UniProtKB/TrEMBL annotation, chain A:
Lineage: Viruses, Duplodnaviria, Heunggongvirae, Uroviricota, Caudoviricetes
Protein name, entry field: Portal protein
Domain of life according to the entry: Viruses
TrEMBL record, chain D:
Source organism: Escherichia phage vB_EcoP_SU10
Top-rank taxon: Viruses
The protein's name in its UniProt record: Major head protein
Automatic annotation (TrEMBL), chain F:
Protein name: Uncharacterized protein
Region of the whole protein represented: 101 to 150 of 250
Protein source organism: Escherichia phage vB_EcoP_SU10
Highest taxon, organism lineage: Viruses
UniProtKB/TrEMBL annotation, chain I:
Full-protein interval shown: 5 to 50 of 747
Descriptive protein name: Portal protein
Amino acid sequence: QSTVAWSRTDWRQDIDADIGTDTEDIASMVWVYEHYIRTGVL
Amino acid sequence: EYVPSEQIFVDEHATSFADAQYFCHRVRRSKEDLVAMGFPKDEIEAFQSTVAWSRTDWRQDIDADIGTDTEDIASMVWVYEHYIRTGVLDKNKESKLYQVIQAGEHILHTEEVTHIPFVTFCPYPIPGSFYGQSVYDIT
Amino acid sequence: ANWISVLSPQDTPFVSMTGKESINQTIFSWQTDALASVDGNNAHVEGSRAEDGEMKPTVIKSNVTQILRKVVRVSRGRELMYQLEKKGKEIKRDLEKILLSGQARTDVLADQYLTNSAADPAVAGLNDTHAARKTGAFQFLCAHGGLAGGVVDKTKNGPADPDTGAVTVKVAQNASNPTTNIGFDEADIFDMTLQLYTAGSEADIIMINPAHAKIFAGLQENTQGSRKRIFENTKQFIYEVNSITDPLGQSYKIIVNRWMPTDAVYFFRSADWTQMVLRAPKRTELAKEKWMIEMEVGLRHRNPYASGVLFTAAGK
Amino acid sequence: DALASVDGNNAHVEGSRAEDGEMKPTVIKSNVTQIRKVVRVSDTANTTA
Amino acid sequence: TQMVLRAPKRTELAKDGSYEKWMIEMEVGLRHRNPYASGVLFTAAGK
Amino acid sequence: RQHGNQPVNFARFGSRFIFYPSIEADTPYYPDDGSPLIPAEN
Amino acid sequence: AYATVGLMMNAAQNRLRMVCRNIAHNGMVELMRGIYNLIRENGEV
Amino acid sequence: KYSEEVLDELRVDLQRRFNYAQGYVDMAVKGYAREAWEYFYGNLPAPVTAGSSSWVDRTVWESVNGTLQDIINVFCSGDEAVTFVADNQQDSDAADVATKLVNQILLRDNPGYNIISSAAQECLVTRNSFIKYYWDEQTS
Amino acid sequence: KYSEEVLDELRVDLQRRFNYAQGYVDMAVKGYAREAWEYFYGNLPA
């Protein structure tokens, strides 16, 4: 859905494709999850 | 110098020159500049982007001979220039950006650079994308 | 809904692992055979009296380039660009499938490619003598030992290089089962590593069809009891292998590719293989409303005895 | 949609005609939704304390 | 993805006096991107 | 056919009904052993 | 600037001014900044 | 002294929270945003029939531009973005400094114009848009 | 001290990246730009 809505904002891009970056290359972009949470984990 | 869009090639996951990971730009440079950086003993290194250009008008044909002899050093030749953000070295190293300039099955120059000298115009821009809109699609 | 789902299997590791190099002719060539043998004894009695040397210079090898069309015919909205990108991906997949096949270059010219004198004299005036350009494949350039007409034979080992006795193409012999299971032996890839080390290839990559990874996966275990995994309070069940080191000290990284023939395995190397291209993919139309693609490409290999291939079957 | 099978015999001849290609439609899928609970009680009370 | 049509949407049906009622209008739907993309295996071939 | 949720059309080409969408039909179970025809799908 | 009679508050005029402002902020200014960073990081004139 | 069991419990809680948040947000926002973007270019109304020649009327795009032009003429019209103002003279010496700093950081360092244009054009069709700022600590 | 194997790997990676970028950009931009230029002179409507 996060990719569908984006690739449908236009009809040119496809975020889930390979622009040419090698997977082992350190600069290879990867999806990370950032979160802000109010909770007593303690 | 101006640069058409028919001689440009970019990745899909990019939305601006900043986060662009790969950016290519075919150029037509004489054999002189190439001899200045590689293969001095060999100067006979011959060879959609043409269709879109020859269809912008109906007069020019980029893939023709305007009269230049192939052996003449000033004979224009297609070279591939690229800007890539990648750890070609040990991936543990930072994702360094690098400019490469190559010819057919031969690399001529490589160096580091922290800024793309290219600039793009984006009328009616489209957020989250590298390409904006156009009057055609509107009319 | 304003989108479409497409599987798009696009591994293509080989194409990105071999790079590419432009050419200026439909037929390219290189020359490299070997260094001179050792000859063993080389004692002398204070006198040369040579025989003009035993140089025996290199042999000249060549390869041909083929054509791929993948026509587009229009009689989602703008389906043109969609079908165009789909056909582009399809032609890329077809290239990845072909370049790793066992094809053998076949054309009217075999070793006298030049023939500038003749060069098919009966061509001009009628222009309908068009033959079919077929390029050399992977298994053909890796020091093959035959070919079933147009395909490499998968039951005959290759010859030996005069520099040092090495057979870089061998018929696998799974000495573990009584010729019932079609799988690599435990010591059949190490033989390839030995042969390569003797020939000096320095390859460090191995492509494999997922229909064979189970073999290397189980290789980490056995039944005799000399190899077994352990789990010291670990919430993991890693069942995979991605690196091998023969007793000779040669590392080998494994990678999986679904576009390989099941009855074969390959030993690749980055620099030893290069992708020669003459005509880049161009979107255009025929003579004086269809669209089409045309990509002239050829295969080049630095030296046959560098890369290695191994066929999987039972002897008979 | 699903791509087509990969070909391994692309050896077309030079200066020839553009052969008709393989083109297929895009399969579509559909579904439907589903529909409550019962709140049976006395309810004669709850008006006073 | 879980395609929802309307949230529970606390609502009432009617009133006969003290005989109160309440209704819910939950409506959803399920979709799958590709049928041949999520695998399942059962146990069969018994006896 | 040239210029072409899905309505249906049919004509009469002498002695043949011609449907555009290329619909497919099937006949039911023929058996005369005192059994029902068991109509067919599509 | 010409609020006397040239209010300019026309749909087309503003639709055009928006695109020109986009071009300026994403175009010329970036070009000048790049040229400045370039001349400032090479050569002795 | 963070325990791994604590981190596992946190991972589980965060995973379930993300699952619920996605299940909500999808049908809450994105189901509408997708079709809104499709209408932006007039691609949602399909050609029901060839003989119909369903010429679409690009109206959403028109209002979007009519609002975006005024928006940019409001904020991005000035050479500067903002300018802090104080209430006493004891803290006026810092107003100009903070103003210069933020203006430099926003325009002379970042493409504030593009950021604002994107946050605007994408907000009027997606029901919202977001901007974010972090501390970049790059090093060679 | 740049190795030739490093340069070969770089060539392969760059070639595949250019292939993907072309396959995308073509249908993303140029398929529309060609017809837009054709409409510029009114040559598309036949």
